[PDB]
Design an enzyme around this catalytic site. Structure first.
Site, PDB file in Angstrom:
ATOM      1  N   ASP B  43       0.828  -1.202   0.000  1.00 24.79           N
ATOM      2  CA  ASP B  43       0.000   0.000   0.000  1.00 24.79           C
ATOM      3  C   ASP B  43       0.865   1.255   0.000  1.00 24.79           C
ATOM      4  O   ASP B  43       2.080   1.177   0.165  1.00 24.79           O
ATOM      5  CB  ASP B  43      -0.932   0.005   1.212  1.00 24.79           C
ATOM      6  CG  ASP B  43      -2.336   0.456   0.864  1.00 24.79           C
ATOM      7  OD1 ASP B  43      -2.534   0.973  -0.255  1.00 24.79           O
ATOM      8  OD2 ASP B  43      -3.242   0.295   1.711  1.00 24.79           O
TER       9      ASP B  43
HETATM   10  C1  LIG Z   1       2.843   6.067  20.428  1.00 22.60           C
HETATM   11  C2  LIG Z   1       1.505   5.679  19.792  1.00 22.60           C
HETATM   12  C3  LIG Z   1       0.385   6.748  19.865  1.00 22.60           C
HETATM   13  C4  LIG Z   1      -0.402   6.987  18.548  1.00 22.60           C
HETATM   14  C5  LIG Z   1      -0.409   8.449  18.021  1.00 22.60           C
HETATM   15  C6  LIG Z   1      -1.751   8.968  17.424  1.00 22.60           C
HETATM   16  C7  LIG Z   1      -1.753   9.278  15.890  1.00 22.60           C
HETATM   17  C8  LIG Z   1      -3.005  10.038  15.329  1.00 22.60           C
HETATM   18  C9  LIG Z   1      -2.923  10.595  13.866  1.00 22.60           C
HETATM   19  C10 LIG Z   1      -4.292  10.836  13.155  1.00 22.60           C
HETATM   20  C11 LIG Z   1      -4.270  11.667  11.834  1.00 22.60           C
HETATM   21  C12 LIG Z   1      -5.139  11.126  10.679  1.00 22.60           C
HETATM   22  O1  LIG Z   1      -5.938  10.252  10.853  1.00 22.60           O
HETATM   23  S1  LIG Z   1      -4.949  11.842   8.981  1.00 22.60           S
HETATM   24  C13 LIG Z   1      -6.367  11.420   7.828  1.00 22.60           C
HETATM   25  C14 LIG Z   1      -6.138  10.156   6.967  1.00 22.60           C
HETATM   26  N1  LIG Z   1      -7.230   9.870   6.023  1.00 22.60           N
HETATM   27  C15 LIG Z   1      -7.186  10.162   4.659  1.00 22.60           C
HETATM   28  O2  LIG Z   1      -6.174  10.694   4.216  1.00 22.60           O
HETATM   29  C16 LIG Z   1      -8.377   9.835   3.769  1.00 22.60           C
HETATM   30  C17 LIG Z   1      -8.079   9.151   2.416  1.00 22.60           C
HETATM   31  N2  LIG Z   1      -7.469   7.828   2.549  1.00 22.60           N
HETATM   32  C18 LIG Z   1      -6.237   7.501   1.951  1.00 22.60           C
HETATM   33  O3  LIG Z   1      -5.701   8.392   1.307  1.00 22.60           O
HETATM   34  C19 LIG Z   1      -5.605   6.090   2.103  1.00 22.60           C
HETATM   35  O4  LIG Z   1      -6.664   5.315   2.546  1.00 22.60           O
HETATM   36  C20 LIG Z   1      -4.432   6.021   3.132  1.00 22.60           C
HETATM   37  C21 LIG Z   1      -4.552   4.808   4.040  1.00 22.60           C
HETATM   38  C22 LIG Z   1      -4.468   7.294   3.952  1.00 22.60           C
HETATM   39  C23 LIG Z   1      -3.013   5.917   2.387  1.00 22.60           C
HETATM   40  O5  LIG Z   1      -3.057   6.536   1.218  1.00 22.60           O
HETATM   41  P1  LIG Z   1      -2.169   5.901  -0.265  1.00 22.60           P
HETATM   42  O6  LIG Z   1      -3.331   5.400  -1.088  1.00 22.60           O
HETATM   43  O7  LIG Z   1      -1.512   7.179  -0.713  1.00 22.60           O
HETATM   44  O8  LIG Z   1      -1.258   4.842   0.311  1.00 22.60           O
END
Ligand SMILES: CCCCCCCCCCCC(=O)SCCNC(=O)CCNC(=O)[C@H](O)C(C)(C)COP(=O)(O)O
Ligand code: SF4
Ligand code: SF4
Lengths: 208, 88, 176, 112, 115, 386
Positions: B43
């Site tokens: 991916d």
């Molecule tokens: C130490 C541990 C603690 C954890 C820390 C907490 C972290 C929180 C961060 C939260 C921020 C978000 O969700 S950020 C929002 C993310 N969502 C999107 O971007 C919507 C569209 N989806 C896509 O583009 C693909 O499904 C994708 C899988 C993204 C890959 O993309 P590719 O097709 O280009 O591989």
């Protein structure tokens, strides 16, 4: 009508009405509505794009001089397409007056940060973002101010539940404070107080 | 003296070592020309981790742009050769 | 109408300069402060000998809650639930039914003392002076459960404190 | 002449008449680049012209301060600079144009 | 049409670029977080959790919603790096004291009335 | 690298639950980052689930050193929205207890500031006076601090039959206690070294950052809400407004002491000018009737029942009401939708803006100077966080 009824002031009412007309004439690009409340409180409804011009004019104009921002907050009205109502309260020391400026936005539309116009807004805009989720563009350091670290959602929104979704307790197995789904020993008891008879005829709405 | 005159063969060997060091890729299956997304069913997020592993391996910052195109090992070798000026 | 707090200029005559030099070198204002503390040392302290001596209170004092009776021994509470409606903390829980003799009485009357803000709104709201905030304030417990009062506990409080509660009400009811 | 304006960070102005005249001339010059039918231009021109006439007609600083109703002429100078900056901004913004957008029909309806 | 104003991105490509940048930053931060907070997890667990949180929102198709999600993730990253967060906050992502709630019909029918 | 330090919440100098994250080079403060919210209780949402009378005790607990002043601001907002008028005796009682409350707040502020600096003694001298004023609170309402005496219709109960005499006896001795405090602090070279030229703010900066109250008046700005926008019977009393010259901690301390003296002046006037009459608005659809009427008359019983179950309805509308609280301008933005519950209640606390400016005021200062600045801003975190 004398002893228990709040007295009126028509002079201040006239002055505020004239100044509202003044402001509307000077900035037709943004001013949508002007109101003078019955207890002499001037209100100016504007377009969001005019947040920075209007305030700047209001704080800089020789005849305005509202150099102080009392407070800045937001109101959530879910029935409106633009959910959030942004309210600025300004005080003029030179003219000993107050003015209220209101605009609107929804969940996904940013508002211009007004830190440049007023330094006081910084924490007010951070607070609005934290409690309501309204993003402010070009804000120096926008982050949560009131809520806990890692807290999800915005508490002041009408949809959010009063007691939230999680609680905290100390757990001895992991030896730390943990967050778990809220369980209540006694549920908050919702009261229905609204009377089925109308109280104020002056505010009656048309029967649609 | 400073670092030796790195060659294309060294770049390819290091890149393939990094790829075979990745858990989500079976080693003997991957080739130099195998597309990351199509051949290995990787991916977009997986590709990002691989590029970051390259930045750790070769010690230079690959921007987000110019990393969206390194989709098979050979393109990685070409990119590093261009950035480090290696021809033979 | 305003005054200035720090807009005074000092005199520059030789006497004033010498007085200020004496103040700087011989530390006169510091001796003034020492004199003030020494003066307080010889006053009588304002401390009281608790628990033997108590702080003054008022008939309007808000303390531990109690349920009262009529002089006949019949309870005053009729389960109107106004105290439960007015309580800003939702600290009151009420359940009621007709008594065996048809009387309108409570079967559950709880006050969660760790929810209560001790505002006294319930005794204002009560139309028969059934719920009161009595004068007691020394009722610290060792467990949280002991502060969850049921009807038996509140009726016992009323029975235990009626003599003082009635005398407090007699002294204040004409202001209510 | 006067010491201690009394406001922290506001220095006493030597030669305030010249400063006020220069500032008001700059303000009128900037207003000259705004369309003549714009309300901002005519209002600001009117008030600026009155203030400039008052400054020209009154050589005495305290009497001028009492005429100007602006609170301690150093503050009048500061307000003039503020108005000049606002005039440049308004020139860039052009708020005399027609309303940009009309709000939704029930947007300002209260209650609900 | 639909007459919307963006936050940062004009289409999904720029939003995806910002998502990738934030993912890179979280990936780099995880080992430092494990060291500073003295967490008993591995770096592999932390990076897996970061990926899981990113994939929770994979279905979003609105560039403005993606921009807000990246803003929130950047807020969380800034919070973690500066140690505003404590170990309890970091460990809240793993739900270590929450008993697993079943998802099949029969177990739900056994435990209670909620679907 | 700058050293990063946690100042509070469990710190004596913190003055509550404040997490001041500080960047330091040696002891010099490079950056102040106040982290608040450790006392955010979600008061405004709770106020939305209450009736207008049930929401009043929240304003007691906003700023826990100026309880009746908080109550008065809320009552003024609700009375403005109800279009009613409190009776004159109630207004005189309100102004008298507002000045007593200002004395309480200024004592607390000055003595806790001195205690941070290191002068621990004046605290004990002044807290006995605070205790006597708590006794005044208790006699009138039954509570030492969270009285809930001031209500949107006037006051809850009339003064007991000997309270004015005791208030007079207290008020005729307090000036000597202020004098002893000033002997301890005003001319001490150590105190002046710890306060003069520390935390200097200009008039322009104070206005822009949203400052109010003493934080304005120490910088020479001539603004007092009791004089410019008077409420209750403040237009009928005479007092001076202290004004500073330098905008530092020392000037703010002198302003507060003189404010204490002017409050004594106002109290003396209020004692000699208290009129007779009723204490709440003679309008039983807003203010509850007397208990004898409630037990004799059908209308009085109906109105008691309805006012204590549902509460009065407030006509729709929004107001911003501000008062000159002892810590600065205290305001309420209250939105009514026509029912007996407030639709929205935004609370404006001066400490919010003052703490937001703390970082500005601490540029080029040390650790101890930052402690002094926190003390001179007069911060209570109940009103900051809400
Ligand atoms: C130490 C541990 C603690 C954890 C820390 C907490 C972290 C929180 C961060 C939260 C921020 C978000 O969700 S950020 C929002 C993310 N969502 C999107 O971007 C919507 C569209 N989806 C896509 O583009 C693909 O499904 C994708 C899988 C993204 C890959 O993309 P590719 O097709 O280009 O591989
Ligand atoms: S004193 Fe106030 S909080 Fe306590 S039970 Fe009575 S009404 Fe409720
Ligand atoms: S205590 Fe008084 S108010 Fe409460 S239910 Fe009984 S009678 Fe009604």
């Amino acid at each position: 009508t004398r002893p228990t009824i709040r007295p009126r002031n028509d002079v201040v009412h006239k002055q505020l009405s004239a100044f509202g007309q003044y402001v509307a004439e000077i900035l037709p690009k943004y001013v949508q509505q002007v109101q003078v409340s019955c207890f002499n409180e001037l209100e100016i409804f504007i377009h969001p794009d005019g947040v920075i011009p209007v305030l700047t004019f209001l704080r800089d104009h020789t005849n305005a001089q509202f150099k102080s921002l009392a407070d800045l907050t937001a109101v959530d009205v879910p029935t409106r397409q633009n959910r959030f109502e942004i309210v600025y309260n300004l005080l003029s020391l030179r003219f000993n007056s107050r003015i209220r400026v209101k605009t609107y936005t929804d969940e996904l539309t940013p508002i211009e940060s007004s830190v440049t116009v007023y330094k006081a807004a910084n924490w007010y805009e951070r607070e609005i973002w934290d409690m309501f989720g309204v993003f402010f563009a070009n804000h120096p350091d926008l982050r949560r101010i009131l809520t806990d670290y890692g807290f999800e959602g915005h508490p002041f929104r009408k949809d959010f539940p009063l007691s939230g979704y999680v609680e905290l307790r100390y757990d001895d197995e992991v030896k730390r404070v943990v967050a778990e789904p809220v369980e209540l020993a006694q549920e908050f008891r919702k009261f229905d107080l609204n009377s089925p008879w109308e109280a104020f005829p002056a505010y009656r709405q048309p029967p649609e | 003296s400073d670092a030796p005159p790195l060659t294309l063969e060294a770049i390819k060997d290091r890149v393939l070592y990094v790829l075979k060091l990745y858990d989500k890729i079976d080693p003997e299956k991957l080739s130099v020309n195998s597309h990351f997304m199509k051949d290995l069913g990787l991916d977009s997020l997986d590709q990002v981790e691989i590029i970051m592993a390259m930045e750790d391996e070769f010690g230079f910052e690959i921007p987000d742009i110019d990393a969206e195109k390194l989709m098979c090992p050979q393109e990685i070798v070409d990119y590093i050769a261009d950035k480090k000026d290696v021809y033979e | 109408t305003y005054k200035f707090v720090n807009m005074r200029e000092p005199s520059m005559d030789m006497k004033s300069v010498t007085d200020r030099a004496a103040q700087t070198l011989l530390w006169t204002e510091l001796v003034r402060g020492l004199g003030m503390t020494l003066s307080y040392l010889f006053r009588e302290p304002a401390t009281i000998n608790y628990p033997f001596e108590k702080g003054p209170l008022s008939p309007r004092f808000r303390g531990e809650h109690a349920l009262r009776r009529y002089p006949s021994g019949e309870e005053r509470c009729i389960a109107c639930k106004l105290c439960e409606a007015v309580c800003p903390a939702q600290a009151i829980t009420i359940e009621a039914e007709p008594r065996a003799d048809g009387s309108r009485r409570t079967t559950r009357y709880d006050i969660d003392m760790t929810k209560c803000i001790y505002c006294g709104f319930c005794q204002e709201a009560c139309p028969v002076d059934a719920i009161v905030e009595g004068p007691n304030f020394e009722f610290s417990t060792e467990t949280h459960e002991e502060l969850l009062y049921n009807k038996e506990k509140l009726l016992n409080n009323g029975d235990k404190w009626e003599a003082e509660i009635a005398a407090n009400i007699q002294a204040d009811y004409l202001y209510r | 002449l006067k010491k201690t304006t009394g406001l922290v960070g506001l220095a006493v102005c030597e030669t305030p008449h010249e400063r006020l005249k220069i500032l008001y001339t700059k303000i009128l010059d900037v207003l000259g680049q705004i369309p003549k039918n714009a309300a901002y231009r005519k209002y600001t021109e009117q008030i600026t012209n009155e203030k400039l006439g008052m400054v020209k007609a009154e050589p005495d600083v305290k009497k001028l301060e009492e005429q100007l109703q602006g609170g301690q002429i150093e503050e009048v100078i500061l307000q003039a600079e503020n108005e000049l900056s606002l005039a440049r901004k308004m020139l860039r913004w052009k708020p005399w144009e027609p309303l940009v957008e009309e709000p939704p029909a029930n947007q300002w309806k209260w209650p609900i | 049409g639909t007459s919307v104003k963006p936050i940062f991105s004009r289409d999904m490509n720029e939003a995806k670029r910002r998502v990738r940048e934030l993912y890179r930053a979280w990936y780099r931060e995880v080992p430092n977080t494990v060291h500073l907070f003295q967490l008993d997890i591995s770096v592999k667990q932390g990076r897996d959790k970061v990926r899981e949180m990113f994939m929770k929102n994979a279905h979003v198709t609105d560039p403005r919603v993606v921009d807000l999600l990246v803003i929130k993730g950047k807020m969380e990253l800034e919070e973690t790096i500066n140690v505003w967060k404590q170990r309890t906050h970091i460990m809240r992502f793993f739900h270590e004291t929450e008993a697993p709630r079943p998802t099949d019909f029969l177990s739900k029918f056994y435990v209670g009335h909620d679907p | 690298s700058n050293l990063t330090l946690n100042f509070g919440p469990q710190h004596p100098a913190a003055h509550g639950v404040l997490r001041l994250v500080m960047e330091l080079s040696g002891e010099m403060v490079r950056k102040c980052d106040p982290h608040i919210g450790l006392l955010h209780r979600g008061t405004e949402k709770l106020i939305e689930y209450k009736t207008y009378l049930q929401a009043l005790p929240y304003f007691d607990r906003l700023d826990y050193v100026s309880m009746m002043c908080n109550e008065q601001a809320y009552s003024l907002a609700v009375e403005k929205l109800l279009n009613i008028q409190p009776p004159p005796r109630a207004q005189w009682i309100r102004v008298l207890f507002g000045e007593i409350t200002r004395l309480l707040n200024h004592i607390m502020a000055v003595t806790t500031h001195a205690l941070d600096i290191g002068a621990m003694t004046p605290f004990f001298w002044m807290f006995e006076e605070r205790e006597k004023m708590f006794e005044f609170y208790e006699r009138v309402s039954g509570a030492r601090m969270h009285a809930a005496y001031i209500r949107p219709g006037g006051v809850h109960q009339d003064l007991p039959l000997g309270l004015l005499d005791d208030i007079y006896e207290f008020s005729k001795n307090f000036s000597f206690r202020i004098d002893e405090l000033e002997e301890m602090l005003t001319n001490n070279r150590i105190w002046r070294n710890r306060t003069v030229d520390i935390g200097v703010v200009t008039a322009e900066d104070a206005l822009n950052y949203g400052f109010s109250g003493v934080m304005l008046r120490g910088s020479g700005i001539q603004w007092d809400l009791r004089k410019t926008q008077p409420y209750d019977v403040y237009d009928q009393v005479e007092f001076d407004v202290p004004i500073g010259s330098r905008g530092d901690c020392y000037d703010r301390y002198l302003c507060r002491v003189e404010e204490m003296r002017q409050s004594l002046r106002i109290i003396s006037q209020c004692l000699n000018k208290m009129p007779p009459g009723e204490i709440k608005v003679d309008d039983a659809k807003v203010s509850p009737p007397k208990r004898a009427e409630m037990k004799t008359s059908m209308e009085s019983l109906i109105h008691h029942f309805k006012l204590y179950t549902e509460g009065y309805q407030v006509p729709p509308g929004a107001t911003y009401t501000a008062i000159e609280a002892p810590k600065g301008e205290f305001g309420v933005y209250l939105v009514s939708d026509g029912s007996s519950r407030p639709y929205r209640c935004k609370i404006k606390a001066p400490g919010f803006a003052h703490l937001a400016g703390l970082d500005k005021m601490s540029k080029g200062h040390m650790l101890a100077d930052v402690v002094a600045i926190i003390g001179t801003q007069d911060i209570v975190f109940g009103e900051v966080d809400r």
